[PDB]
Amino acid sequence: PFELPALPYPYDALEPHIDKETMNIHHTKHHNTYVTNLNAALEGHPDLQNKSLEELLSNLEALPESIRTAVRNNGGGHANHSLFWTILSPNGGGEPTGELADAINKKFGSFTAFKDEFSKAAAGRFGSGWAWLVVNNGELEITSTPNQDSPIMEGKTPILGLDVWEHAYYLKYQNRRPEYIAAFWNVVNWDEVAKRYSEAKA
Amino acid sequence: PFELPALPYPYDALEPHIDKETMNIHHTKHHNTYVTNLNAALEGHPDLQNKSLEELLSNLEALPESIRTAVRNNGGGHANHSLFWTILSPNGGGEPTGELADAINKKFGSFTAFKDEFSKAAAGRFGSGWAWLVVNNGELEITSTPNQDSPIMEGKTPILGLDVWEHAYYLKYQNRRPEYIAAFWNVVNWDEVAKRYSEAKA
Ligand SMILES: [Mn+2]
Ligand SMILES: [Mn+2]
């Protein structure tokens, strides 16, 4: 079944940009709740217990109506937060390089303009949701989704996401989401984003 | 123009059920932001500037296309928090009385049963939103809405509401929303809910 992934860094590694208390609660309680509920939803269906998260979220239409919403919300929660951890790093920040930077420069004109568009999208998502950079049939684009909806449901491959649920920033930033977004850029693991872009292109 | 209402009690008054810090921030920053953004969307539209919040939210389609969303979200936020403050009280708690008590026993069986299904409605609202006791053509019903949507848009009159945006409970309760839902019952101003129920029946 599905398992809570271990973090690749200590819970305080992202200070002062994300507080360790938030990292611990976000991971051990928010994320792990999504995993347990996801597993609970599929307990009665050996049909589905051997399918990847990507397969389930691409075939939401086919799942029984009794669990469709559970898989949507808890499967999305698991998929989104699993990606989130990997694209953070205490050694992150800076700018992308190589093929990825070249792709960003062509679609958005500059890395600066990409940051602005991504920050605007993250600030504009009313209520709970996520802001994404995705690969959509070989092309980069910025989008945002509500609640725990994953772009995989729309046939898009996420390579970078920013959780803008209030639980991701309230303890430290309270209502000041924009400076949580500003702080986010100092811990982005661009090497991981590039790896995911290299893989999504295929 | 619309203005941020004064609270009829100190920020200290609902302890230990709701922390003063949250009350202060919820009022002067979250709610205030909704009011200012509502007034800003209406600037340049003097035809809309003497219409009540109820009239605005009931005919969102009549509003121009470019401000419709701003009014739904910030108008809804203003209407919802305005009601929220009035149904909290340091002298609250207990059970309803009289007309409202009979209407609740009749429709839900008993105050305990109504509490149970109102608590589950509040807990089951995924993401941001509100739990409501509304009057719908003279009849009581429990419902919930996403984000800052107000049941006034559907033609229902809210007489009691519970804010379940994470900012409403995260500083004190973090992920434990049910703990916050349970504490909410100790500060409910049932007298206010009664006056509202009395007036919606007209
Ligand atoms: Mn989250
Ligand atoms: Mn609120």
CATH code (residue B113): 3.55.40.20
End-to-end CA distance of chain B: 28
CATH of the domain at A57: 1.10.287.990
DSSP state at residue B21: H
Note whether residue A133 is domain-resident: yes
Pair (B182, B161) in one structural domain: yes
Instruction: Report the candidate in A140, A144, A139 with the shortest Cα–Cα distance to residue A121.
Output: A144
Nearest chain A alpha carbon to B126: A147
Pair (A135, A189) in one structural domain: yes
Note whether residue A141 is domain-resident: yes
CB < 8 Å & 24+ apart, contacts of B106-115: B107/B139, B107/B140, B107/B141, B108/B140, B114/B142, B115/B185
Ligand 1 centroid from CA B92, angstroms: 34
Pair (B123, B180) in one structural domain: yes
Note whether residue B5 is domain-resident: no
Q: Which residues contact A23 (CB under 8 A, 6 or more apart)?
A: A7, A11, A12, A14
Nearest ligand to the CA of B129 is 2
B124 in contact with A at a CB cutoff of 8 Å? no
Pair (A26, A114) in one structural domain: no
Domain boundary among A46, A62, A87: A87
Pair (B69, B48) in one structural domain: yes
| Tokens linked to A14 | 């992202």
Peptide bond between residue A5 and the one before it cis (omega within 30 degrees of 0): no
Note whether residue B33 is domain-resident: yes
Total domains in the fold of chain A = 2
Which of the residues B145, B166, B169 would you substitute to probe the A interface, choosing the one with the greatest number of A C-beta atoms within 10 Å?
Answer: B166
State the residue range of the domain holding A184.
98-201
| Tokens linked to B30 | 């979250």
Note whether residue A55 is domain-resident: yes
Count of other CB atoms within 10 angstroms of residue B172: 18
Pair (B81, B30) in one structural domain: yes
Note whether residue B10 is domain-resident: no
Q: Is B149 helix (H, G, I), strand (E, B) or coil?
A: coil
B46 in contact with A at a CB cutoff of 8 Å? no
Note whether residue B164 is domain-resident: yes
Decide: B92 and B83 in contact? Cβ < 8 Å.
no
Interface of B with A in 155-174 (CB under 8 A): 165-167, 170-171, 174
Ligand 2 centroid from CA B56, angstroms: 20
Pair (B45, B131) in one structural domain: no
Instruction: Report the candidate in A27, A181, A22, A18 with the shortest Cα–Cα distance to residue A90.
Output: A18
Ligand 1 centroid from CA A111, angstroms: 26
Pair (A69, A106) in one structural domain: no
**C-alpha to C-alpha distance for A140 and B128, rounded to whole angstroms:** 29
> Looking at CA atoms only, how far is residue A163 from chain B in angstroms?
12
Note whether residue A193 is domain-resident: yes
Pair (A129, A187) in one structural domain: yes
What's chain A look like in SS3? CCCCCCCCCCCCCCCCCCCHHHHHHHHHHHHHHHHHHHHHHHCCCCCCCCCCHHHHHHCHHHCCHHHHHHHHHHHHHHHHHHHHHHCECCCCCCCCCHHHHHHHHHHHCCHHHHHHHHHHHHHHCCCCEEEEEEEECCEEEEEEEECCCCHHHHCCEEEEEEECCHHHCHHHHCCCHHHHHHHHHHHECHHHHHHHHHHHCC
Pair (B64, B129) in one structural domain: no
Pair (B141, B71) in one structural domain: no
Pair (B124, B36) in one structural domain: no
Helices (H), chain B: 20-25, 32-42, 53-58, 68-86, 98-108, 111-124, 170-173, 177-184, 190-200
User: Which of A29, A129, A170 lies closest to B167 in CB terms?
Assistant: A170
